[PDB]
């Protein structure tokens, strides 16, 4: 079902697109898993620990 | 909101009191960053009653962990709400869905 | 074999008021990616632009407050102003004013029309007034700059005194949002190894595509002087 | 973890990798080929090593 | 400057003795007028002390005979 | 001390009978005062701010 | 006041001066190691990966 | 102003050899280390012109894996020794040198017939060895001008042995981008370029030529 919804959005069904390096502009030699994770910012902030 | 949730986000956001859930359905008569005035439907109001629910939102208070617990009106003016709808997103909720 | 066919700014296709496809042609074999990535790295980091950097709303002392009538906190109003696309001609700093009364969305078109300040997206919603007697009056200071200057690393700047009520906004000065570039083959002089670079550029509308390419190439060429001389 | 994966990926060999079988004057020519895109990092080649 | 002390340990065949000799030398150059025997390339006196150990210019015997020599020459200031 | 006594008999800048016990922002904290609350024991006169 | 000259003085006084970095539990003697400091702008100690 | 940038103030060239240097530019703006360094890397690597051996026709040899007695190394290693033969041809676009040697010892690069407009920059380059004093080598080396690197498999008569043509003078071009600070702005860059050439062009001259090539590519957009 994930692959079918990937195909509906016209994205590659393997979930791995090819990325280019931003610094040298040349491609990473293998496809790279790119997506959208849900990142959480936890309450262990470095301002409070230093 | 999580692009990929499980479906318990609405339940966690409502069953914790961080949000402002409409007690009786109605129309938003007035909405403002610090309060929501709901004009109740004639179905749900008692006889001998103004028929208006005021929800005073909580703005920039301290949690026990020194974070801020701040409520934003989710509804807009003149919008029909029902009994149980989220009128104000608390901290870490987006349109009634828990969003951390 | 020692002379190189030098590129030229062939065609600037304007997909939208914020999208563009500049075409550089003809590029020798290998210079497509060199120029493309150098220009992308410069465009994406060092183009100049105008950003809202200070707001002064009338009855407001700090961002962590509300105003009666306005649907949004003052913090959300500052966030909606941080994305104000505005272009200033001739100045490097200008104080816009916004006065609006009565129920309705306060959009960027209610900013008072100055002559040398052009608001790119006039439907940019700043706030909502939800009371017929409500009114908001603010003074939006937009300022020209480069890069990203957060207000935290700006409050070092000891201007003689900053009053209570001036809300500093983080300044994201750069006008470009996305650069992509493709290298395709060109159809020039029967020659077949000559490529062409299509730089697709997506901005907020406050910069011209030809002007942005000119400025990227100017930055690059003036930085290459320390290598051309090499003393 | 990251170092050993980089050094393992570098020192492997593919079968028909780009630029296979050519003869190289030394490690510097291998680096020039690979940075030019003219030889894969896994191209089995013949290199003069001192 | 200094990233690894291994060359100086071959002259003073220990690490603990090296620490003690270089600390005695570094205190000579730090509180004391005794200038380095190597070019002071913006180094601290611990690192200059080590750079002197490494060239054989300083060891326990050398510092001992210098202590004897300058001690005789400045306690024989009998006037 | 005797030396502090001489230092103050030279310049005449006398010692103060009160000691600064102020409340200060902790180091590294940088923010906005958003609320001030004053609690006065009944019997103490309120200042202008209370 | 953190005047601009105390940052040059501070670059001078850490120059060849090592610091001990220690992670608890110090299970074995490589749990305390001395590194030469490099002054950075963050608030996190930047530990070389191999150690 | 918003159009003025940091330009390199401390340019410390360090000649590790006559053909190997370490250029250091500091400070650059944040991110311009990679911009400049990779642009120069690509140009020096693939786009700078020079001249190199492209073809060898040696008489008794028919193909790359053929054999010849009298030489102590295979034909593969003779082409490998001719590939690294640095050469400077001034007057022409293509020249053909000749090598005729009989005797014992190294057929070194000083044994090529002395042409006018061809200078071999390292005449002590070994080409092959001769061990029999009756077996001589006669080869015709085609030195051609071009740019970059063109491997032999890209270019593919009988008797010719295609050599991978290292046209550009550089042999190695690396760069690091380290941190640098000016006036408590810690975020600035410092570009350490490190370059070895094959001897036909001194390193800082090669960097001048690469920056000139890039600047002249830019000369159609740059505003005064």
Interface contact E19, partner G, CB < 8 A: no
Q: Give whole-number Cα distances, C83 to A50, C77, C171, C174, in Å.
A: 34, 10, 9, 11
CA distance C197 to chain H (A): 13
Q: Do chains B and G touch (3 or more CB pairs under 8 A)?
A: no
Is residue C176 within 8 A of residue C200, CB to CB? The reply is no
Is residue H182 within 8 A of residue H27, CB to CB? The reply is yes
First-residue to last-residue Cα distance in chain A? 46
The dihedral through the CA atoms of C187, C188, C192, C197 has a sign that is negative
Segment 64-103 of chain C within 8 Å of chain F by CB: 64-65
Is residue H47 within 8 A of residue H147, CB to CB? The reply is yes
Is residue D19 within 8 A of residue H151, CB to CB? The reply is yes
Q: Cis before residue G25, ω within 30 degrees of 0?
A: yes
Residue C184: CB partners within 8 Å, gap ≥ 6?
C195, C196, C198
Is residue C56 within 8 A of residue C166, CB to CB? The reply is yes
Say how far apart CA D47 and CA D25 lie, in whole Å.
6
CA distance A37 to chain C (A): 21
Q: Give whole-number Cα distances, H217 to C26, C39, C224, H10, H161, in Å.
A: 10, 12, 12, 26, 36
First-residue to last-residue Cα distance in chain E? 44
Exposure of C146 in the CB half-sphere (CA atoms within 13 A): 16
Contact C41 A22 (CB under 8 A): yes
Q: Take residue B47 and report the two structure tokens written for it.
A: 């006889």
Q: Take residue B78 and report the two structure tokens written for it.
A: 């003149």
Domain containing residue C73: 48-172
Is residue H71 within 8 A of residue H99, CB to CB? The reply is no
Say how far apart CA C67 and CA C135 lie, in whole Å.
10
The dihedral through the CA atoms of E18, E20, E25, E31 has a sign that is positive
The dihedral through the CA atoms of H101, H106, H109, H114 has a sign that is negative
- Phi and psi at C34, nearest 5°, equal -60, -60
Q: Give whole-number Cα distances, C171 to C4, C57, C106, C144, C154, in Å.
A: 42, 18, 21, 9, 10
Q: What is the DSSP string of chain H?
A: --S----------EEEETTEEEEEEEEEPTTHHHHHHHHHHHHHHHT-EEEEEEEEEETT--STT---TTBSS-HHHHHHHHHT--EEE-S-SEEEEEEEE-SSEEEEGGGB---SSEEES-TT-EEEEE-SSS--EEEEEEEEEEESEE-HHHH---SEEE--EE-SSEEEEEEEEEEEEETTEEEEEEEEEEEEE-SSS-HHHHHHHHHHHHHHHHTTT---
Is residue H129 within 8 A of residue H72, CB to CB? The reply is yes
Closest listed residue to residue C228, CA positions, set A24, H213, B4, B9: H213
Helix (H), strand (E), coil (C) string for C57-84: ECCCCCCCCCCCCECCCHHHHHHHHCCC
Strands (E), chain B: 20-21, 26-32, 35-40, 52-56, 61-62, 68-69, 72-73, 80-81, 86-89, 93-94, 97-98
Q: Is C104 exposed, middle or buried (0-12, 13-18, 19+ CB in 10 A)?
A: middle
What Å resolution does this PDB entry report? 2.7
- Phi and psi at C125, nearest 5°, equal -75, 120
Say how far apart CA C200 and CA C20 lie, in whole Å.
6
Cβ neighbour number for residue H158 with a 10 Å cutoff: 6
Using DSSP's 3-state secondary structure scheme, residue C183 falls into strand
CA torsion angle C203 C209 C212 C217 (round to 10): 130
Q: Cis before residue H27, ω within 30 degrees of 0?
A: yes
Tokens 């193909």, residue located: H63
Q: Take residue C127 and report the two structure tokens written for it.
A: 């706030």
Residues after which a C–N gap over 2.5 Å breaks chain H? 156
Exposure of B34 in the CB half-sphere (CA atoms within 13 A): 11
CA distance D48 to chain G (A): 32
**Nearest 5°: CA angle at C111, between C107 and C116?**
130
Q: Take residue H194 and report the two structure tokens written for it.
A: 């490190």
CA distance C52 to chain F (A): 20
Contact C72 B31 (CB under 8 A): no
Closest listed residue to residue B98, CA positions, set B39, B15, B38, B30: B15
Residue to mutate among A38, A42, A43, with most B CBs inside 10 A, is A38
Tokens 């009114």, residue located: C135
Of B3, B4, B65, the CB nearest to A43: B65
Is residue C11 within 8 A of residue C24, CB to CB? The reply is no
C102 DSSP assignment: S
Is residue E48 within 8 A of residue E54, CB to CB? The reply is no
Is residue C76 within 8 A of residue B78, CB to CB? The reply is no
Is residue B90 within 8 A of residue B18, CB to CB? The reply is yes
CA distance C171 to chain H (A): 14
Is residue D32 within 8 A of residue H45, CB to CB? The reply is yes
Q: Which long-range contacts (CB under 8 A, 24 or more apart) does H175-182 make?
A: H175/H33, H175/H37, H175/H38, H175/H40, H175/H41, H177/H33, H177/H34, H177/H37, H180/H26, H180/H27, H180/H28, H181/H27, H182/H6, H182/H27
Q: Take residue G15 and report the two structure tokens written for it.
A: 């120059």
Residues of C in contact with H147 (CB under 8 A): 1-2
Buried b or exposed e, range E37-46, using 16+ CB within 10 angstroms:
beeeeebbbb
Q: Take residue D5 and report the two structure tokens written for it.
A: 């994966």
Closest listed residue to residue E51, CA positions, set E32, E36, E31, E66: E36
Q: What is the DSSP string of G4-50?
A: HHHHHHHHHHTTT--EEEE-SS--SGGGEEEE-----SSSS----TT
Is residue H76 within 8 A of residue D21, CB to CB? The reply is no
**Nearest 5°: CA angle at H56, between H52 and H59?**
160
Contact H32 C214 (CB under 8 A): no
Cβ neighbour number for residue C225 with a 10 Å cutoff: 13
Tokens 């191999």, residue located: G50
**Nearest 5°: CA angle at H100, between H97 and H104?**
140
Nearest-Cα residue of chain B relative to residue A39: B100
Task: Report strand pairing: H160-162 vs H149-150.
Answer: unpaired
Q: Take residue C41 and report the two structure tokens written for it.
A: 């790295």
The CATH number that applies at residue C63 is 2.170.120.12
Q: Give whole-number Cα distances, H182 to E42, E51, G11, H152, in Å.
A: 20, 31, 13, 49
Strand partners, H94: H144
How was this entry determined? cryo-EM
Chains in contact with F, counting 3 or more C-beta pairs less than 8 Å apart as contact:
C
């Amino acid at each position: 079902e994930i692959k079918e919804l990937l195909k509906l959005g016209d994205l590659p069904t393997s979930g791995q697109i090819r990325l280019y390096d931003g610094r040298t502009g040349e491609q990473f030699e293998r496809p790279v898993t790119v997506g959208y994770m849900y990142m959480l910012k936890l309450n262990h902030l470095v301002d409070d620990k230093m | 909101k999580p692009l990929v949730g499980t479906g318990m986000e609405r339940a966690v956001a409502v069953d914790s009191g961080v949000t402002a859930v409409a007690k009786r359905g109605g129309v938003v008569q007035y909405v403002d960053a610090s309060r929501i005035v709901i004009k109740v439907n004639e179905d749900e109001m008692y006889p001998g009653e103004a028929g208006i629910d005021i929800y005073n939102l909580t703005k920039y208070t301290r949690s026990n962990q020194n974070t801020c617990i701040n409520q934003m009106p989710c509804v807009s003016l003149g919008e029909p709400v029902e009994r149980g709808d989220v009128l104000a997103d608390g901290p870490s909720t987006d349109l009634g869905e828990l969003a951390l | 074999v020692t002379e190189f066919l030098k590129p030229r700014l062939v065609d600037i296709e304007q997909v939208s008021s914020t999208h563009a496809k500049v075409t550089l042609e003809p590029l020798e074999r290998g210079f497509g990616h060199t120029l493309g990535n150098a220009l992308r790295r410069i465009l994406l980091s060092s183009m100049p632009g105008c950003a809202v950097t200070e707001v002064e709303i009338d009855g407001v002392l700090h961002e962590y407050s509300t105003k009666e009538g306005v649907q949004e906190d003052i913090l959300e109003i500052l966030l909606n102003l941080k994305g104000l696309a505005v272009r200033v001609q001739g100045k490097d700093e200008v104080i816009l004013t916004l006065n609006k009364s009565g129920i309705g969305p306060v959009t960027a078109a209610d900013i008072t029309h100055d002559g040398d300040v052009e608001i790119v997206k006039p439907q940019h919603v700043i706030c909502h007034l939800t009371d017929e007697n409500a009114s908001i009056s603010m003074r939006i200071k937009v300022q020209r700059g480069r890069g990203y200057v957060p207000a935290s690393t700006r409050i070092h700047s000891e201007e003689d005194e900053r009053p209570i009520g001036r809300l500093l906004v983080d300044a994201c000065y750069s006008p470009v949002e996305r650069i992509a570039y493709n290298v395709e083959a060109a159809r020039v002089e029967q020659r077949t190894d000559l490529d062409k670079l299509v730089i697709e550029m997506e901005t907020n509308g406050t910069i011209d595509p030809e002007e942005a390419i000119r400025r990227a190439a100017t930055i690059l060429a003036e930085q290459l002087e320390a290598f051309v001389d090499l003393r | 973890q990251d170092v050993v994966l980089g050094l393992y990926y570098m020192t492997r060999d593919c079968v028909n990798a780009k630029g296979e079988g050519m003869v190289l004057t030394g490690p510097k020519e291998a680096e020039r080929l690979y940075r030019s895109g003219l030889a894969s990092l896994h191209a089995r080649v013949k290199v003069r090593i001192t | 400057a200094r990233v690894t002390v291994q060359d100086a340990v071959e002259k003073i065949g220990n690490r603990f003795d090296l620490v003690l000799v270089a600390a005695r030398r570094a205190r000579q150059m730090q509180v004391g007028g005794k200038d380095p025997l190597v070019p002071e390339e913006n180094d601290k006196t611990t690192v200059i002390a080590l750079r002197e150990i490494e060239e054989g210019l300083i060891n326990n015997q050398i510092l001992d005979v210098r202590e004897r020599q300058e001690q005789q020459e400045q306690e024989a200031a009998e006037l | 001390t005797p030396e502090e006594k001489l230092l103050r008999a030279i310049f005449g800048e006398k010692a103060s009978d009160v000691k600064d016990s102020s409340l200060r922002v902790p180091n590294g904290v940088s923010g906005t005062v958003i609320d001030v609350q004053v609690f006065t024991r009944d019997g103490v006169e309120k200042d202008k701010r209370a | 006041r953190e005047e601009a000259v105390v940052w040059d003085i501070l670059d001078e006084v850490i120059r060849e001066h090592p610091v001990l970095l220690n992670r608890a539990p110090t299970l074995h003697r490589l749990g305390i190691q001395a590194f030469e400091p490099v002054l950075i702008e963050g608030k996190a100690i930047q530990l070389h990966p191999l150690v």
